[PDB]
Amino acid sequence: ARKVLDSPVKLNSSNFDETLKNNENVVVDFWAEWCHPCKMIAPVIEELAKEYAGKVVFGKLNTDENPTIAARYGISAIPTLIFFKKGKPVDQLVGAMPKSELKRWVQRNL
């Protein structure tokens, strides 16, 4: 059938902590419009968001627009992906990565 959320969703101060609290599995993509590697992986994240629709919520946290939230996790390079299980960070991926590696990363934590 069709899922409620099947694509990446914008996160900011109005829904970041709430999304983590109310969804068992969340992947947050920390990104910025000036980051070339971020743009390079965006299509892969979209595809995985469709593939794991209903299982994993893919959030996008713009680091320019939400510096405090990014600083909370010590984001020192982008793109950084963090896997949140039950609202807690349990794994991370830093820098652009192939889809195959990205998917295995999800499967390892989901």
Residue numbers in the entry: 25 to 134
How is this structure described in the published paper?
Thioredoxins and thioredoxin-like proteins (glutaredoxins and protein disulfide isomerases) are prevalent in nature and found throughout all kingdoms of life. These disulfide/dithiol oxidoreductases function via their surface-exposed, redox-active disulfide bond. The cellular functions of these proteins vary, ranging from electron transfer in response to oxidative stress to folding and refolding of proteins, while their varied functions are linked to the range of redox potentials spanned by the disulfide bond, nearly 300 mV. In this paper we systematically test both hypotheses with a series of thioredoxins from Archaeoglobus fulgidus (Af) and Thermoplasma acidophilum (Ta), which have been shown previously to possess disulfide bond redox potentials spanning -32 mV to -287 mV at pH 6.
As the names imply, the mutant AfTrx3HP has the active site sequence CHPC; AfTrx3PH has the sequence CPHC, and AfTrx3KP has the sequence CKPC. To ensure that AfTrx3 is a representative Trx, the crystal structure of AfTrx3HP was solved to 1.95 Å resolution. The AfTrx3HP mutant crystallized better than wild-type and thus was used to provide a structural depiction of this archaeal protein. The structure consists of two molecules in the asymmetric unit (a.s.u), where both structures are complete except for the first 25–26 residues at N-termini, which are disordered. AfTrx3HP shares the classic Trx fold, consisting of a central core of five β-strands enclosed by four α-helices. The active site loop is found at the end of a α-helix on the surface of the protein where it can interact with its partner proteins to catalyze disulfide exchange. Comparison with E. coli Trx in the region of the active site shows that the only major difference is in the sequence of the CXXC loop itself. In particular, the difference is due to the substitution of His (60 in this A. fulgidus mutant) with Gly (33 in E. coli). Indeed the disulfide is in a hydrophobic environment, blocked from direct contact with solvent by residues Trp 58, Pro 61, Ile 102, Pro 103. Inspection of the structure of the AfTrx3HP CHPC motif (inset) shows M60H is oriented out into solution, and is neither able to interact with the cysteine in the active site nor is it able to provide any stabilizing hydrogen bonding interactions with any part of the protein fold.
